[PDB]
Design a protein around this ligand. Structure first.
Ligand SMILES: C[C@H](OP(=O)(O)OC[C@@H](O)[C@@H](O)[C@@H](O)Cn1c2nc(=O)[nH]c(=O)c-2cc2ccc(O)cc21)C(=O)N[C@@H](CCC(=O)N[C@@H](CCC(=O)O)C(=O)O)C(=O)O
Length: 109
C-alpha cells in the first residue's frame, strides 16, 4: 500500500545501529521522512539518534543510501508537508493531536 524505507541510525547512547521502517518522499537525491511516531507526544528515538549522529543509512528496496539527516527548513516543510499529507493523510491528524511540531527530516547525499 504505502512502501517503507528502512532508516538506520546510530544509537546516541549505545552507539549501536537501530533500524526503523518509515514512510518517505524522494526528491532530487534526498529522502524525506516525518518523525510522527503515530501521534505520540515525544519524538521517536531514531529522531533523537540522528540529531546526535547525523550520518544515517536509508534502504529503499535494493538501494542503500548513505545520507546526512537534518531538520527541514520552514520553506522545505511548506513544500514537503503537503506532499506527505497527500500520501498519508493521518500525518495531519498526528500533527494536530501533538503539541510538539512533528519533525520533517531531510536526508541528503
Ligand atoms: C520504540 C523505539 O522506536 P523509536 O525510535 O522511538 O521509533 C518509534 C516509531 O517512529 C517507529 O517504531 C516507526 O518505525 C513507526 N513507523 C513510523 N514512524 C514514524 O515516526 N513515521 C513514519 O512514517 C512511520 C511509518 C511506519 C510504517 C510502518 C511501521 O510498521 C512503522 C512506522 C525503539 O525501537 N526502541 C529501541 C531502540 C531505541 C534506541 O534507538 N536507543 C538509543 C537510545 C535512545 C535514547 O534513550 O536516547 C540507543 O541505542 O542509544 C529499544 O528500546 O530497544
Amino acid at each position: 500500500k504505502i512502501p517503507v524505507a528502512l532508516l538506520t541510525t546510530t544509537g546516541r547512547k549505545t552507539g549501536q545501529p537501530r533500524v526503523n521502517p518509515l514512510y518517505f518522499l524522494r526528491d532530487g537525491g534526498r529522502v524525506i521522512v516525518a518523525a510522527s511516531k503515530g501521534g505520540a507526544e515525544k519524538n521517536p528515538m531514531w529522531y533523537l539518534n540522528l540529531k546526535a549522529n547525523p550520518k544515517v543509512q536509508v534502504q529503499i528496496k535494493k538501494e542503500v543510501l548513505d545520507l546526512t539527516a537534518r531538520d527541514a527548513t520552514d520553506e522545505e516543510r511548506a513544500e514537503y508537508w503537503p506532499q506527505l499529507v497527500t500520501m498519508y493523510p493521518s500525518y495531519q491528524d498526528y500533527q494536530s493531536w501533538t503539541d510538539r511540531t512533528i519533525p520533517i527530516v531531510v536526508c541528503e547525499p
